[PDB]
Amino acid sequence: VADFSPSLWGDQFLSFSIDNQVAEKYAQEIEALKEQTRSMLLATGRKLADTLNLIDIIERLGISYHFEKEIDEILDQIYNQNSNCNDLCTSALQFRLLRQHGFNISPEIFSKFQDENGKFKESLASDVLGLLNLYEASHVRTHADDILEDALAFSTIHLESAAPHLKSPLREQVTHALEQCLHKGVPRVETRFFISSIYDKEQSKNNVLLRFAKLDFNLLQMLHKQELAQVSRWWKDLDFVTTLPYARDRVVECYFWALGVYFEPQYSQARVMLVKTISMISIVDDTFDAYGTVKELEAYTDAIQRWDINEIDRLPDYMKISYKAILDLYKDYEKELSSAGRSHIVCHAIERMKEVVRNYNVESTWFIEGYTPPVSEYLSNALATTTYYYLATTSYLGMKSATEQDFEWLSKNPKILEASVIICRVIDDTATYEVEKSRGQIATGIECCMRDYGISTKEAMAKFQNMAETAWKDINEGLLRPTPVSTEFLTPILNLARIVEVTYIHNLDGYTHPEEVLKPHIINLLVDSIKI
Ligand SMILES: CC(C)=CCC/C(C)=C/CC/C(C)=C/[C@H](O)P(=O)(O)O
Ligand SMILES: [Mg+2]
Ligand SMILES: [Mg+2]
Ligand SMILES: [Mg+2]
């Protein structure tokens, strides 16, 4: 029965008229602050620590997307010079920034901070700025970085101990880091927090950078607001709120998801297309889970595979609405890309959609039979039901630079994509185990793991956590140069992994239950603008 809570928002987003006067004002001053900030990056005689801090600040402020070349060449130069700025803070920052950019900098730089036993000198426990940067850096480690195996536990215990007596805004920056690291967090979300809660309150803040950050964030927010309005109208013209009452109305939440994948203005068309897909597949998921019967679902799955409007008659009236909306959406996609001549790539997203549906069917079949497959079998089916292979393929649709070779690479299920999918699965299964078990779904991850290995619930979740950790180290390795495809195409995958982490931060389904997790984010990103 129904159960799902209605949209918290309402028509709050259908309407958005951009005051073109304020937009142009912001744009004009931004361009000036842009070159001022560019000149700052091009400064000659700056120290390593100062240069790393500048780059770090510009990134955290969310304005680094304007200087991808400038920042790259500086980090490239820093990578090849191998200068030993000897302190922990500068070292950890140097490590993180280079790694996040693909530069495979050796982790032995952390040797000078460890004793002959390989552990961190407990004497560094009084260096907060060093401990903090080390904490952030501990989240970007790969499988070849065992030198940092105790870095997270080290920095954490000492950061928690020192936190209560630190001056603001440092105290808040640390408290926030311990709750959410920079690397595994959503870009806009972390930027919003840095700009308003940290940098603005920083005594040594650079006013030009703060002004730039605030204006830019607010200007882009106007675009996000426009996009969300366009997708809200599109969502109402479908009126699935009344025709398909069993489904979830989370179009705003789906926009947040697409905004987490990419926020840059150039990805406007991409975000819009992606929001429509997530929203659409959410219904298909809602159909197989809380509505359709064994027969109906089998007819639906088969209909999707054929991908022809003629098969609509075999489907009951309510499924006819879903089925047609889906084909039309893809016809719209083909039409949007008709201009550039990138219509020939829509099929990739479709083949992935069919895959998701096949597994949705298998998932229900297992539920009916009361099947509890071994972990091996479970994953071979449950990985696609996360829809991550699908969403990742979709994100490329609007990306004007995406070629055939990029989709070709993605179809082979790369390790980075594979890792991203695993994280989404493991995290969802750890959070939703108990709830799904109460509904009779004994085919869930933790359950399969428990009976397959003969371990308790605690051990099963603990092992799943290790799978996510491994997946994270795998994602970190995928970013390292030479990348199989352009970095532009690896970020969406990375972001997808970031969104799950952030959504299930309180170990609860954030999409189905937005209010506690997603609500604040949506308010801070799509409602309230950073007050200047
Ligand atoms: C709650 C949802 C739909 C969030 C959408 C974003 C998403 C990738 C979340 C993780 C995987 C899914 C798809 C869970 C399903 O809902 P389920 O466990 O019901 O198959
Ligand atoms: Mg569901
Ligand atoms: Mg489902
Ligand atoms: Mg689940």
Side-chain angles (χ1 to χ4, degrees), residues 159-178:
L159 280 179
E160 297 179 327
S161 188
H165 308 106
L166 302 176
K167 63 178 182 180
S168 300
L170 183 66
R171 183 182 180 173
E172 287 62 56
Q173 184 171 220
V174 173
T175 299
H176 180 69
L178 298 177

Side-chain angles (χ1 to χ4, degrees), residues 269-314:
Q269 182 181 29
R271 272 194 297 283
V272 182
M273 297 177 105
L274 180 51
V275 183
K276 293 176 178 172
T277 290
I278 305 180
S279 207
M280 206 69 264
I281 190 62
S282 181
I283 296 176
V284 183
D285 183 79
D286 286 311
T287 305
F288 281 85
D289 264 46
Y291 216 65
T293 55
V294 193
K295 284 190 176 182
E296 297 184 297
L297 300 179
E298 179 63 64
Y300 198 78
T301 302
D302 186 61
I304 292 292
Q305 305 307 325
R306 269 69 184 288
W307 204 261
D308 198 299
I309 200 163
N310 260 300
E311 314 299 312
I312 199 172
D313 302 286
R314 301 183 184 193

Side-chain angles (χ1 to χ4, degrees), residues 388-428:
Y388 267 30
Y389 298 100
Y390 179 37
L391 305 187
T393 304
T394 299
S395 67
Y396 287 25
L397 294 176
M399 299 176 79
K400 306 167 186 177
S401 302
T403 64
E404 258 294 315
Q405 294 187 21
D406 292 326
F407 283 96
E408 204 164 26
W409 168 81
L410 198 66
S411 61
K412 299 185 186 182
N413 290 357
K415 199 169 189 179
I416 185 169
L417 177 54
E418 203 61 67
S420 180
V421 178
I422 296 178
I423 293 168
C424 182
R425 182 72 283 159
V426 162
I427 292 179
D428 181 283

Side-chain angles (χ1 to χ4, degrees), residues 248 257 285 289 363 385-388 391 424-425 428 436 504 509 511-512:
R248 290 173 298 212
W257 224 275
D285 183 79
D289 264 46
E363 190 177 320
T385 57
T386 65
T387 72
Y388 267 30
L391 305 187
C424 182
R425 182 72 283 159
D428 181 283
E436 293 176 320
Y504 293 74
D509 194 354
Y511 180 95
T512 303

Side-chain angles (χ1 to χ4, degrees), residues 61 96 101 152 193 198 206 230 241 267 289 298-299 308 333 344 358 493:
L61 291 170
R96 181 166 71 69
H101 285 247
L152 179 61
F193 178 83
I198 306 303
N206 176 293
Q230 180 186 328
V241 193
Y267 297 133
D289 264 46
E298 179 63 64
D308 198 299
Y333 288 166
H344 61 101
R358 285 181 235 130
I493 296 175

